[PDB]
Ligand SMILES: Nc1nc2c(ncn2[C@@H]2O[C@H](COP(=O)(O)OP(=O)(O)O)[C@@H](O)[C@H]2O)c(=O)[nH]1
């Protein structure tokens with residue numbers, strides 16, 4: 001089973017992958033379009049094996065390699081059993097993904113389950129942990145500090 | 161499985177070989193130098209021998225910050241390999257001995273580490289496909305793009321490891 005991390009550039013997807021995999025699998029920098037290739041890591045939580053999949057931040061890109069990466073990101077989404085929609089919490093106060101980026105949500109395969117991840121809690125000062133918005137699971141965490149990531153782990157085990 | 165690290169100059173065809181070995185389009189391939197920066201890992205089996213095939217950023221003095229980091233990571237993979245496939249673009253040099261091609265690369269490798277020299281783009285150079293030896297190193301001529309000579313590589317990996 002496959003969990004895809006997807007969202008805008010610099011949301012912290014690669015930072016999250018590395019937190020979940022417990023190794024420095026993906027390059028992380030503040031440059032949008034750092035990740036282009038699809039990065040896949042095998043993990044387990046508690047008897048449950050899954051593939052965690054990091055992808056290029058979604059946009060209309062003039063960088064050819066990044067454009068290909070973005071096409072591949074959408075292809076990963078097509079095959080996902082769950083998507084983690086990573087959001088830079090510093091960029092917006094909205095919590096409902098329909099307010100955050102309605103085109104992304106509308107484009108997702110029908111009934112692919114979505115978890116909304118508001119990252120960079122360390123900057124915003126948001127309360128860490130889980131809640132629900134319009135029926136979507138919502139988690140506030142810091143991929144950089146690890147603060148809140150166990151709540152993501154338990155969530156994956158319970159939900160899938 | 162044992163770690164086989166694909167290393168060499170940019171555009172040699174490293175990702176093209178990863179994809180040929182893995183039997184899927186795991187890495188992005190383009191005519192642009194510095195396409196791969198992140199380390200890519202593909203687990204495969206050759207006649208029931210498992211192997212971890214590792215693709216890396218082409219080694220150069222890169223201006224791009226992420227490519228520079230990818231190049232650092234490439235040397236970290238090399239340091240920890242069980243074997244290195246030294247990928248050489250046959251269209252850019254007729255030298256076959258790695259000591260003539262890039263002595264600094266060869267000298268920097270960990271003492272015990274076996275290397276297989278791979279002369280890619282045989283479809284272009286018209287080099288005869290298959291296996292030979294240069295200064296004690298296995299030397300294989302193949303084309304990652306057409307797949308010609310890749311079976312020779314798979315067989316060598318099985319026999320040698
Ligand atoms: N303060 C803070 N910065 C973060 C966090 N997660 C990621 N970043 C930073 O945001 C930038 C982009 O992160 P990265 O994982 O490359 O984003 P990606 O493009 O979505 O994969 C980097 O400078 C990270 O250090 C976080 O939880 N807190």
Ligand SMILES: Nc1nc2c(ncn2[C@@H]2O[C@H](COP(=O)(O)OP(=O)(O)O)[C@@H](O)[C@H]2O)c(=O)[nH]1
Nearest residue numbers: 171172173174175176189190191281303304305
């Ligand atoms: N004709 C030919 N072209 C190749 C071969 N292998 C790779 N290429 C081309 O060389 C360019 C670079 O390939 P790529 O795999 O991205 O090289 P890398 O940067 O070393 O990973 C691309 O245009 C490939 O299609 C080959 O065996 N024959």
Ligand code: ALF
Nearest residue numbers: 009033034035057
């Ligand atoms: F902008 Al990125 F991985 F660097 F989505």
Ligand code: ALF
Nearest residue numbers: 170171194195218
């Ligand atoms: F130049 Al490359 F992977 F694009 F080594």
Ligand SMILES: [K+]
Nearest residue numbers: 010029031034
């Ligand atoms: K980034």
Ligand SMILES: [K+]
Nearest residue numbers: 171190192195
């Ligand atoms: K390339």
Ligand SMILES: [Mg+2]
Nearest residue numbers: 013014034035
């Ligand atoms: Mg990234």
Ligand SMILES: [Mg+2]
Nearest residue numbers: 174175195196
């Ligand atoms: Mg490559």
Ligand SMILES: [Se]
Nearest residue numbers: 042161203212
């Ligand atoms: Se693996």
